[PDB]
């Protein structure tokens, strides 16, 4: 999962306020509609994962169907959302 | 603001995968309707948080038109999830 240094840094060290944009898989076209959805943050995006109890269905669904990710984008998302939380929550 | 130890233990370590009645403010009866509205677990009321920017009126009306809890039992939460944050968000 050749993912960018974003997922391992994320997951190594406290989201704080980064943007929407910083998540892995999430590009900047993304963390702008995502945005527009009321997301200007990361932490609201990290809370839709909590919400969805890490249904990894209903997380690709909501992404995909939110803003049109791919199910190669997606899968970033969930696993590092997932990840960070495994080491944060 | 004389919380049950439950607020500092939360606050002093990982929160993993306790009920929603374990949240300070949330008490048995409330627990059990914010598990009737799809939260069985308390990871998945924070990220209700999350997902509220921390707007406080947002997050009290939420809870509060939820399952009826007082502006009592809402800032225990408010305060009680936002502390969590700051040391583990």
């Known amino acids: 999962m050749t993912t960018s240094q974003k997922h ?7 989201m ?5 944009g ?3 898989g ?3 076209v993304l ?9 200007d943050k990361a932490y609201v995006v990290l809370g839709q994962f909590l919400v969805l109890k ?3 269905d209903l997380f690709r ?8 990710a791919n199910a190669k984008q997606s899968r970033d998302c969930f696993g590092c959302l997932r990840e960070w939380c495994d080491a944060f929550l």
């Open 8 to 14: 391992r840094d994320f997951v190594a060290e406290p």
């Open 61 to 68: 669904e909501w992404l995909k169907d939110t803003c049109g």
């Open 22 to 24: 910083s998540l892995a």
């Open 31 to 39: 963390g702008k509609k995502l945005e527009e959805r009321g997301f």
């Open 54 to 56: 890490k249904d990894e």
């Open 26 to 28: 999430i590009g900047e």
């Open 16 to 20: 704080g306020e980064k943007p929407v």
